[PDB]
Amino acid sequence: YDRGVNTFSPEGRLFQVEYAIEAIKLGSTAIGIQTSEGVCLAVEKRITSPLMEPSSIEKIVEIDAHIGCAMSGLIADAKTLIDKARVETQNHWFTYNETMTVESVTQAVSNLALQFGEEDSRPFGVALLFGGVDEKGPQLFHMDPSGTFVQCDARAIGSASEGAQSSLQEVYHKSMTLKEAIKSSLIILKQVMEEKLNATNIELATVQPGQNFHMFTKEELEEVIKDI
Amino acid sequence: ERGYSFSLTTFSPSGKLVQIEYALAAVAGGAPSVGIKAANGVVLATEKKQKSILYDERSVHKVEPITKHIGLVYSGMGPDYRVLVHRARKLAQQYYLVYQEPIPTAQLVQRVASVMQEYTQSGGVRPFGVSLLICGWNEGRPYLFQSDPSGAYFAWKATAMGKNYVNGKTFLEKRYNEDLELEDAIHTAILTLKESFEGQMTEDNIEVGICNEAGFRRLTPTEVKDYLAAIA
């Protein structure tokens, strides 16, 4: 009846890697869009209670000064992967005196993602977006509980993932600007969330070639909302 | 290789450790044996029948000495007995290398029963299937203790272990008093082993060991024939 954690299916995939793919369909939705002007990257918060403090939770968190992140699915075990990424970017700066590229951050995390077992205990149930500006310009990557990562241009992850991707393939083109990519993302998030859109249910962050990783706050954010 | 590192002895929903309850069933199907202390020494007597005439009875021994003054018999299964003998032989030495003194019989049972309790909780092991009777005369007064596979112990005046042990304890209750010599306790230990043996109780079907203040020793079949004579 009870298999081990490390068993192949008769169709050949695995059991608990495939079960963890299902777990990120319960998390809050998140949208990232790569634009040659820069990477914009948004999320909802899914506020449960009026008594709850809204800003104590976060989904956007920074890894380095030029790399941001976005998490979905579970949250408590996402903080383990974030801490391994922050240490890895500082060991690369310490030994090579430069900034680690956005792609090489992702494979440094993706090697960790499939290492459970019974020696030395379950796969991580999160999904991540990595937005950053390295020397090849703005980048956007997406990893998996399976540890498979690939560069995306407009990736939407969460409970409303497949509903948003269809509405995102029609509006994206290769010559966007960042001012309209920010506006195009909040049109999508206005459809898919439950509550109404305001300055507290969502938050954004953009990374630029010029300046570093900047996270918007509740003063400069609602001018996008009132001019939607 | 490696082990299992999980206890295969758990609590029942009725609150009873079932594997220890099964180990007492293997103890009750062993060879019968009685032990009696009376005012100057302890008598340990067991019942050793070879299955056929081909066996050499002078090869193995039920009654074993632990030190100068401590003997030990059993009633259970064979190969488990020789393990905790060699364990108890060693435990009497580490007491002696520290204190330069023969070990008290009470402190031996403190440490032998601690092995048996430790062995019924640790990972991947079945408990022992033997019960013991331990004698000895430390500081004049003799002692007679009985352990069990669970790891507890008691302080008996006279008791029986093995098959028909519930009949021997009724027989000893109508026989034993406070005032007997050592040679009287020998005569009533043969009289209680005759309750369950076969028709021929010869000089080699039984095995008797005694303690004095002169120390533990084990009887040769010469005087065992003299005690078996003029008996019952």
Next chain:
Amino acid sequence: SIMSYNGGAVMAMKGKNCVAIAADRRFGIQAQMVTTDFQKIFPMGDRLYIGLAGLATDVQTVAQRLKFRLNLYELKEGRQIKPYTLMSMVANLLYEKRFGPYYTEPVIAGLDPKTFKPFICSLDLIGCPMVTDDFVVSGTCAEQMYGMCESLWEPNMDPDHLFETISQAMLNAVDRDAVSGMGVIVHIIEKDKITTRTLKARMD
């Protein structure tokens, strides 16, 4: 040397049906006293004492390791410890540091609890027990204490003359030593009572 870093002297002496032990009171660092009430005799049950002399660290260290092992003994067993048994216990403790040794030399004196018979012994710093019948001494001023005890000891002595002999043995020898002094405490035990006295010595 190492034993001469703090000084100290412990003497035990056997009597008729009684045994006495004595030690000095000085604590100091090579020339300089610090206090004159340093404890060097420790009680180990009734009618059984131990004296320690040597390096001042290991005097307080062994006297706490031994009490750690003694209370475990007197609870696991229901009785008090024999004086011959403690001699094997202390010798085991010192030999474990065969290559990291404690710099002390213990002296054990007490009465056997059932048959009230005196017992004295002494040990080196790695645990060689030596039982005698007259006296044992330990400390820096050892040779001065042999000239006292070989000249003054009598075989069968009441507790009055036992006290006066061990007092004159300590006061005259420790006065001849430089790094030992500042008062002498004397414990004399017997089967009915026990007695602690302090002597009027040179504070010089």
Next chain:
Amino acid sequence: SYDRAITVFSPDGHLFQVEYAQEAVKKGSTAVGVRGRDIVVLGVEKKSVAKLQDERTVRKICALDDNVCMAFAGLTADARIVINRARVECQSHRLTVEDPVTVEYITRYIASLKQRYTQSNGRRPFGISALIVGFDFDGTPRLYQTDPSGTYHAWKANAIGRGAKSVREFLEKNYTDEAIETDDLTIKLVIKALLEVVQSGGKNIELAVMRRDQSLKILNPEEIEKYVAEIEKEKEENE
């Protein structure tokens, strides 16, 4: 070493032993915590004492530091070892970075200690939830909670344990801005909620406040007798 994965995934994407641990939280006694602007108010309900026996050993409001209080619910066996492990990390923090431990730092140590403990082999997860209440540097009173999966989470009011959502629905219609006007006014905000819970007839309640400069101060059953006298008197004249 007992090496075995205890918490594994479900065929629909859940963790069984985590959501089983949240049921064990839901039958512990109710702890309620609110915050003011200068004084914080927190107090467990359903003391359930035998009322002829000892009471100074049964306390469920302790101190991690001079500035950090901590209440909890759930099974108390797994709770007083998380506290004793939190009293060491906050003490070893002072040997490092010189400040007293902020209320945000001590919640991350507890939540990370609980998440990696839902990850390891041979380990059932903790069956407790807690409220960490403190007043950090520069006088900013705030509180948090902690789920048995290890998700630290701030609030303005909270209530956990058995009979929590009955209080949590009551608090949001009861939490106003002017309820945090005075110190003793906010204490009556707690006393109405615990009276709207398991019985709490004054002898089963136990509150304890902190004036942002003191230690934790438990009032004896004379002020709670006084407060439930005047909170019921205001209800008897309004209705």
Next chain:
Amino acid sequence: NQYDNDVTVWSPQGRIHQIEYAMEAVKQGSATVGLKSKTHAVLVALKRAQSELAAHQKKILHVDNHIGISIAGLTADARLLCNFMRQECLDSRFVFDRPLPVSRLVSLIGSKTQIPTQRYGRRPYGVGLLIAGYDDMGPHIFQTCPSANYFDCRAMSIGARSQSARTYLERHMSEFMECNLNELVKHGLRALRETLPAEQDLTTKNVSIGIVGKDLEFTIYDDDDVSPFLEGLEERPQ
């Protein structure tokens, strides 16, 4: 089926089912074709994607200057053997100061992957390594499988719908040992148009080619430099 749970358990027929299920994992990945001449070793892969805006997953990797591999299966176990592959090449170059031979590399992999196929609670490595390289004996094409059984071959193809590619390679392998680099590649490119549905073939963003050559270091060509190789193919006959 109670004989279908752990790698340790033999079947009553004598076929361990956990090994046979890892063969199903390599049949899920996309196809790739390797082949060799007298003097060259060319392997050609076919990428896939998830949406039209996501990028294509690469499959050809660079192990050393004279060894390159191509993967099929789950990508996480591919990088686990890849980082073992790179490590075993540069330490032999550290010790002996020589390129490690290809036929001696693969036997290290076969001893590496056989170990978790015999212990308890240890999965096999689901991966599809096609290896191309140089000994001092010319080109070599090697394939592996999760049963830890490596094969010496001269042209193979593995992945989803690969039996149609093998039938093309059998009826043209008499020509392979003569041709130069140009039509050696487009012999292999005619195998990848065999393993596709009849409408989309080779649109310069899903195909990659890697060549090691007798005076040529191992080189990967991606989605722009493919276009010189990819032109010069006829239309699909229908």
Next chain:
Amino acid sequence: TGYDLSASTFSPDGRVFQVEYAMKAVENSSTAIGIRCKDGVVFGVEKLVLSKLYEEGSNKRLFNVDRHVGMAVAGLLADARSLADIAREEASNFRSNFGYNIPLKHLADRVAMYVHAYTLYSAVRPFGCSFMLGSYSVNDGAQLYMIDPSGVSYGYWGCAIGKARQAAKTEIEKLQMKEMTCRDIVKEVAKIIYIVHDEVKDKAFELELSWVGELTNGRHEIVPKDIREEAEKYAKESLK
């Protein structure tokens, strides 16, 4: 059922099925025969051409353990070359510790105790390979051993492992290996493995032969091409 999952449990009639199930996996590998002549040992393996795409000289079922010791395997090939690695490593510890070349009565003893060690525990499985060991020494003559997956070894004048085992060793005892030298043996080794494996089951197959003795000066090596062409010349005369 339930009595046959682990190798740590006996059956209720007292035998281990996990070893017997691994013995069944040997009879799906094809055929490996080896007989010893008067002054040497000759191996022989018929090799199934699975497809045209494999290369002539691939995946040899005939190893080379030491300078004088040879191995011919039959079973799951991953476990074959894993047993070949420890036997190649065991002979290296003998020469390094004791100075000289390992004898076969000791070499097959050390390997069979390594194979037996996996027929006891639940953590490991039994091997799925049976194999043969043959060699020649100038002080001991020719030797020929054979090891099953249980761990039992014996000496042989000639043995056979594979699909058709009895159908191969029926014709081996028609020979006279006591007096023939290892030249005419090579033609007789090939002939008894042409009469087996009808062409209905396999289309085409590959001959692979091995060879040791003082004619090879003690060293183990493969046969030359011309000698095995004489045996392949001696192939199609079994139709009479």
Next chain:
Amino acid sequence: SSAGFDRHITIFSPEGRLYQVEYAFKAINQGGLTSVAVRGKDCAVIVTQKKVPDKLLDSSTVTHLFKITENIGCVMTGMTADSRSQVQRARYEAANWKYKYGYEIPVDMLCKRIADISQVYTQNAEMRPLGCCMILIGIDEEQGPQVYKCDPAGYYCGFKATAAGVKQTESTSFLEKKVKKKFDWTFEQTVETAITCLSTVLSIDFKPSEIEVGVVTVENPKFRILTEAEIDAHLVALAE
């Protein structure tokens, strides 16, 4: 009579039995073999049969008699793979007696160390308890000859006549009628009464190519294995 996994691993039944050991006693019987050991007044004789079903097999490598030390021999029953592993331990334990204690190990002390090792297999619930038996002979000073049996349960005893294998009970019933009439036993009578044991139980009346006999005597304490020629001398004298 069964509850839990008591059929599968070595734990107690509700009746106090434990089945994995008494399953292993009838794993000895699957060898199809029977060995007899008889102690004499000044000698000790082991006799056992050997069954060679093939002409292609080397008949000098099937000896179940093994030389443990220079003065200690043994015979092995049960399955072959476990029996040869247990001989390897007994060679190792005797050499460590000589290195640690400086004199030759007594044969009862060696049987104790083997039975203590075999105890641990039925003591942990992980290992399979080695379904093969063990019979030792040897000359001891101030004891004469003596014979010991060790079973896979960890039990041992000194015997005077010993049978082990398939026909154990029929052989011991023959021998117990032979010994209790208490004839004196020379050297050749113990050879005669041991061959006529398994010649009347098995009803063979054989030629000397199917049995093998080891012996020790207090004039030559070396364990020695008889030549087939001198086996034939005792056999034709057995037919008067």
Next chain:
Amino acid sequence: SRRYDSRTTIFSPEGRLYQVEYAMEAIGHAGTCLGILANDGVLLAAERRNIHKLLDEVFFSEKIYKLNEDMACSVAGITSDANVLTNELRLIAQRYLLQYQEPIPCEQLVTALCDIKQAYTQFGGKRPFGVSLLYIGWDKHYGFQLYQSDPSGNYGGWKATCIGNNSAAAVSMLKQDYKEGEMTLKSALALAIKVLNKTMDVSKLSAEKVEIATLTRENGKTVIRVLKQKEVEQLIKKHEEEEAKAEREK
């Protein structure tokens, strides 16, 4: 190997855990111990179980164990599991005395043992202890103290508690007859013989069937006195004289 694992650590789907509740089910049967204090002194009343006519009656105690030089414990449950715990916190008190050169406070000895007991219920895949036990003792911080341990790992201070087979009947009567701080160490002894008159179904109160040990504070002694079998029965009949007086006059 995962087929034979019994998982003695996991939760149940109703939220609670089964393994320690089976242990506390077994802690009800097999034994009876109780304690009482209100003033100078504290007592442990325990009932003997094996009262067979062939025993030596030695080792100074049966269920009483002296732990420190000024505190002791009474145990209930599996006796073999008890012997491991009793010589485990016996050297917890000694390693305290080695470290601080001061006798251990009675409360933080209990918390030290109840953390070892809690760990087996929480990880390791290991059988927990089916042992609950009492604690009497004295310290300079609070005086006479009385604690109770549970197999789950949680303790508690008390004034009078029983862990017998009819322990609920004893507690129901202890909170029917009690006085806070006025029960001297003679009225508590008369109350102790009254309670185990009820819960012991073997009537007439055999003096060899019970054991009573008292801890009184003498100036530097803290005398732990196991009172002998010559003064039990006069305390037994003293309960018997007053009950015939109180029944007839009412």
